[PDB]
Amino acid sequence: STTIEYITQRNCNLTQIGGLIDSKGYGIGTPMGSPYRDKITIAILQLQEEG
Amino acid sequence: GATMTFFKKSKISTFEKMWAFMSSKPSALVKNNEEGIQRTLTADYALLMESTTIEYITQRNCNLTQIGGLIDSKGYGIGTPMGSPYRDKITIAILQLQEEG
Amino acid sequence: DGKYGAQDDKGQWNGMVKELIDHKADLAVAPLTITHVREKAIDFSKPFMT
Amino acid sequence: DGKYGAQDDKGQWNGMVKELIDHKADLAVAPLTITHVREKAIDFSKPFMT
- Tell me which chain C residues have a C-beta less than 8 angstroms from the C-beta of B79: 16-17, 20, 27-28, 32, 42-45
In sign, the C-alpha dihedral spanning A27, C43, A22, A9 is: negative
- Chain B, 1 to 20: residues with Cβ < 8 Å from chain A are 6, 9-12, 15
Q: Determination technique for this PDB entry?
A: cryo-EM
Q: What are phi and psi of A35, to 5 degrees?
A: -85, -25
Q: What angle do CA A37, A38, A39 make, to 5 degrees?
A: 95
DSSP strands (E only) in C1-50? 28-33
Q: What are phi and psi of B14, to 5 degrees?
A: -60, -50
With b for 16 or more beta-carbon neighbours within 10 A and e for fewer, the B12-29 pattern comes to eeebeeebeeeeeeeeee
Note the Cα C20 to chain centre separation in Å: 7
Nearest Cα residue in chain A from B74: A48
CB burial class (10 A; 0-12, 13-18, 19+) of residue B9? Answer: middle
- Interface chains of chain B (3 or more CB pairs under 8 Å): A, C, D
Query: Resolution in A for the shown PDB structure?
Result: 5.9
Nearest to A25 by CA among D39, B38, B81, B93: D39
Nearest to B64 by CA among B92, B45, B89: B45
- Chain C, 10 to 49: residues with Cβ < 8 Å from chain B are 16-17, 20-21, 23, 25-34, 42-49
Choose among B9, B70, B98: nearest Cβ to A50: B9
User: Are D33 and D45 a contacting pair, CB within 8 Å?
Assistant: no
Q: What are phi and psi of A42, to 5 degrees?
A: -65, -45
- Tell me which chain B residues have a C-beta less than 8 angstroms from the C-beta of D43: 88
Q: Is C33 annotated as a binding residue?
A: yes
- Tell me which chain D residues have a C-beta less than 8 angstroms from the C-beta of B95: 34-36, 39
User: Are B80 and C43 a contacting pair, CB within 8 Å?
Assistant: yes
- Tell me which chain A residues have a C-beta less than 8 angstroms from the C-beta of D31: 2, 26
CA–CA min distance A30, chain D (Å): 5
> CB distance from D40 to chain C under 8 Å?
no
Please tell me the distance from the alpha carbon of residue A48 to that of residue C23, in angstroms, as a whole number.
29
Nearest Cα residue in chain D from B99: D35
